[PDB]
Amino acid sequence: KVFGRCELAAAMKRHGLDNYRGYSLGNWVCAAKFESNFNTQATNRNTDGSTDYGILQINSRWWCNDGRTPGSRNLCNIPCSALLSSDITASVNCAKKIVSDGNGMNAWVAWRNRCKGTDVQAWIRGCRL
Ligand SMILES: [Cl-]
Ligand SMILES: [Cl-]
Ligand SMILES: [Cl-]
Ligand SMILES: [Cl-]
Ligand SMILES: [Cl-]
Ligand SMILES: [Cl-]
Ligand SMILES: [Cl-]
Ligand SMILES: [Cl-]
Ligand SMILES: [Cl-]
Ligand code: NA
Ligand code: NA
Ligand code: NA
């Protein structure tokens, strides 16, 4: 599923991401935009052999099991395929764990490089929330 900008903002808020660990809704939508272009089915292979899955490109190195990432962990305790569902619940629950792990949203390199410090409020401008 490819979410609309405001559609995704609304889904994220409903699932408790708005201001979660102090990260305003705009931060999450910005991250999703640059990680996946709002596409729940997005995947990308990393140089180390791990794979990133879903709207927030959660990595199989640490967070989900894809059965093809040697020596990895599955800390969200979910198959990576669950991170590609049209329903964002699994991705949101797992992101809550990631953002809580000490480094906040810096875990998402694109967020650090493209969203951090920017006018992220613009990502939710005009949205009925
Ligand atoms: Cl899709
Ligand atoms: Cl957009
Ligand atoms: Cl915001
Ligand atoms: Cl892939
Ligand atoms: Cl992989
Ligand atoms: Cl994701
Ligand atoms: Cl594995
Ligand atoms: Cl594990
Ligand atoms: Cl933080
Ligand atoms: Na905070
Ligand atoms: Na894909
Ligand atoms: Na894994």
Swiss-Prot record:
Entry's localization field: Secreted
PANTHER family per UniProt: LYSOZYME C
GO cellular component, one term: cytoplasm
Function: Lysozymes have primarily a bacteriolytic function; those in tissues and body fluids are associated with the monocyte-macrophage system and enhance the activity of immunoagents. Has bacteriolytic activity against M.luteus.
Residues involved in substrate binding: D101
Entry keyword annotation includes Zinc: no
GO molecular function (one): identical protein binding
Organism: Gallus gallus
Gene3D superfamilies: 1.10.530.10
Gene, per the UniProt record: LYZ
UniProt xrefs under InterPro entries: Glyco_hydro_22, Glyco_hydro_22_CS, Glyco_hydro_22_lys, Lysozyme-like_dom_sf
Active site location: E35, D52
Main location (coarse class): secreted
Catalytic activity: Hydrolysis of (1->4)-beta-linkages between N-acetylmuramic acid and N-acetyl-D-glucosamine residues in a peptidoglycan and between N-acetyl-D-glucosamine residues in chitodextrins
Subunit structure: Monomer.
Protein name in the entry: Lysozyme C
Keywords in alphabetical order: Allergen, Antimicrobial, Bacteriolytic enzyme, Disulfide bond, Glycosidase, Hydrolase, Secreted, Signal
Tissue: In the egg white and polymorphonuclear leukocytes.
SS bonds (residue pairs): C6-C127, C30-C115, C64-C80, C76-C94
Name of the top EC class for this enzyme: hydrolase
